[PDB]
């Protein structure tokens, strides 16, 4: 009662919405991403706040705080267990949805922008389309991402090889701590700074925007996409990839799609059809690469072809927000130090990959400039030794159609064990699983034994320091959720 008084006092009322309000289910479901959290029997907040001036974001929070009435921020909507609109257990909270807050403004000279948090990905990339065509920034692949969400957790996408992590390319941020308080990089100080380009979303407060710099691309990429059956040699041709892709150079990401016995090499390179034919036939002869496979386009272009395989639909594709894509999802990811056996490659292709209810496999190449980044210089930790990330993806459409799904990504994941980074058994913070860990809750704050099992595989070393600097920022756990940095406190 007295938090929604408090909010109305300071935020217009058409920016508040409570469950009665006739509009709160369509602005709750407006950027859902995942079916499985759109159903009744999931949590639901007490209340939505669509703040458009980041004075409204710091009304949210004094009153959250005065009140004590917990917030979960969202931007894109895209966490993989729904944490920023939903809880896992009955409890009360708030979602600030930044949704409204979308303004990027790029200063293309200075090779500077600003990136409202509530800004797509797409939304960003066409802004800086906009303003040049030879400037990019490497972030995520799938445009309706949220800038919040990627940011905060890192983000990698076809440019990490060449210019590492969005986080890692981040100069400034507006910010709103625990207790409303506006901050940028001079006034929160190295911890603060260092802990939310990387250290995961939620845990060091509401990121209202981010100053990012521009990197230069070619006026023209290239991208290939090409297949191997089993029959056309695919072990083979993998088993020699998982050395060679990490060791080819900065321009060149290869990653792999894998879905069957069968296995899509796909290609970005800030080159042309003219000096990449000749590198391939140095370096991955084995790929049978020749100039029919080129696909030459500006990098911009690159962003749907990649993703979705269309050339001819650039503003459609990347300013999206229709939200028509919401399959049921279930997702896992590991990093690979060692090169994978053959006959694990023979078995992941004929067998794994040919069960009820199997998925999808991402594999993507690290080494050059992710990994030249010290393990501890960003909370991401992913980075030297490093010589593919795999994800494991799967979708379904009915919503009694989940047990074998779930099944097989356990099952893949146990068997998978052995051949992947183990104590601890890394795993990519944005590609959040709930089932490495979640948080105790004593005395109201979230313990940090409890955080310590799921965070060191998001972060390996650099966990503690993340939650020494919670501790500094965020005391009382106010900003949390069941799997965000515990304060450790003296
Ligand atoms: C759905 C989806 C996700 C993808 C896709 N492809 C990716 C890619 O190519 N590269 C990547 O690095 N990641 C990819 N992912 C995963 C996404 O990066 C993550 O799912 C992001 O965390 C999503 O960000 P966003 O869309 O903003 O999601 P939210 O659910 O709003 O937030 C996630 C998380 O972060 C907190 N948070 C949101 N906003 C803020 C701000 N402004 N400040 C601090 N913290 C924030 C939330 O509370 C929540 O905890 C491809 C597809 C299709
Ligand atoms: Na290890
Ligand atoms: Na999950």
Redesign the pocket.
């Known amino acids: 009662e007295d938090f929604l008084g408090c909010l109305v006092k300071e935020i217009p009322p058409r920016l508040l919405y409570a469950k009665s309000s006739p509009a709160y289910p369509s602005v709750l479901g407006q950027?859902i991403?995942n079916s499985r959290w759109s159903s009744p029997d999931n949590v639901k907040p007490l209340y939505i706040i669509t703040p458009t001036q980041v004075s409204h974001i710091q009304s949210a929070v004094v009153c959250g705080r005065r009140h004590t009435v917990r917030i979960?921020?969202?931007?894109?909507?895209?966490?993989?267990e729904?944490?920023?609109?939903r809880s896992l257990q009955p409890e009360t909270f708030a979602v600030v949805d930044?949704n409204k807050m979308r303004a990027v403004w790029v200063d293309g000279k200075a090779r500077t922008a600003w990136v409202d948090?509530g800004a797509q990905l797409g939304e960003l990339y066409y802004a800086i389309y906009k303003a040049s065509p030879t400037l990019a920034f490497p972030?995520?692949?799938?445009p309706?991402?949220?800038?919040?969400?990627?940011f905060?957790?890192?983000?990698?996408?076809m440019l990490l090889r060449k210019y590492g992590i969005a986080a890692e390319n981040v100069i400034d941020v507006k910010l709103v701590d625990a207790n409303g308080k506006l901050h940028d990089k001079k006034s929160m100080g190295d911890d603060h700074f260092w802990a939310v380009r990387g250290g995961?979303?939620?845990s060091?407060?509401?990121?209202?925007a981010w100053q990012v710099k521009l990197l230069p691309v070619p006026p023209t990429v290239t991208i290939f996409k090409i297949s191997k059956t089993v029959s056309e040699g695919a072990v083979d041709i993998i088993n020699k990839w998982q050395v060679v892709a990490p060791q080819l150079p900065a321009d060149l990401m290869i990653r792999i799609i894998a879905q069957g016995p069968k296995a899509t090499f796909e290609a970005m390179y800030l080159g042309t059809c003219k000096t990449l034919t000749p590198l391939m036939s140095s370096k991955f002869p084995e790929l049978g690469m020749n100039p029919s496979h080129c696909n030459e386009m500006s990098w911009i272009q690159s962003i749907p072809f990649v993703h979705l395989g269309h050339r001819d639909a650039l503003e459609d594709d990347l300013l999206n927000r229709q939200n028509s894509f919401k399959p049921f999802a279930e997702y896992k990811s590991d990093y690979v130090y060692q090169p994978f056996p053959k006959t694990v490659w023979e078995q992941i292709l004929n067998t794994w990959l040919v069960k009820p209810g199997a998925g999808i496999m991402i594999f993507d190449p690290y080494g050059a400039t992710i990994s030249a980044t010290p393990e501890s210089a960003t909370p991401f930790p992913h980075r030297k030794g490093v010589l593919f990330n795999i994800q494991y993806v799967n979708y379904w459409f009915a919503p009694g159609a989940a047990a074998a799904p779930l099944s097989w990504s356990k099952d893949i994941y146990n068997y998978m064990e052995p051949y992947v980074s183990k104590n601890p058994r890394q795993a990519?913070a944005?590609?959040?699983d709930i089932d490495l860990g979640r948080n105790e809750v004593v005395n109201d704050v979230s313990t940090y034994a409890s955080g310590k099992v799921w965070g060191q595989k998001y972060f390996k070393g650099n966990f503690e320091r993340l939650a020494i600097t919670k501790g500094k920022v965020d005391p009382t756990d106010y900003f949390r959720?069941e799997q965000?940095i515990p304060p450790l406190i003296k």
């Open positions: 950027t991403r979960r921020v969202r931007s894109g909507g895209h966490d993989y729904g944490l920023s609109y930044l948090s972030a995520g692949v799938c309706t991402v949220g800038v919040g969400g990627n905060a957790g890192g983000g990698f996408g995961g979303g939620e060091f407060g509401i990121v209202v990519y944005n590609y959040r959720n965000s």
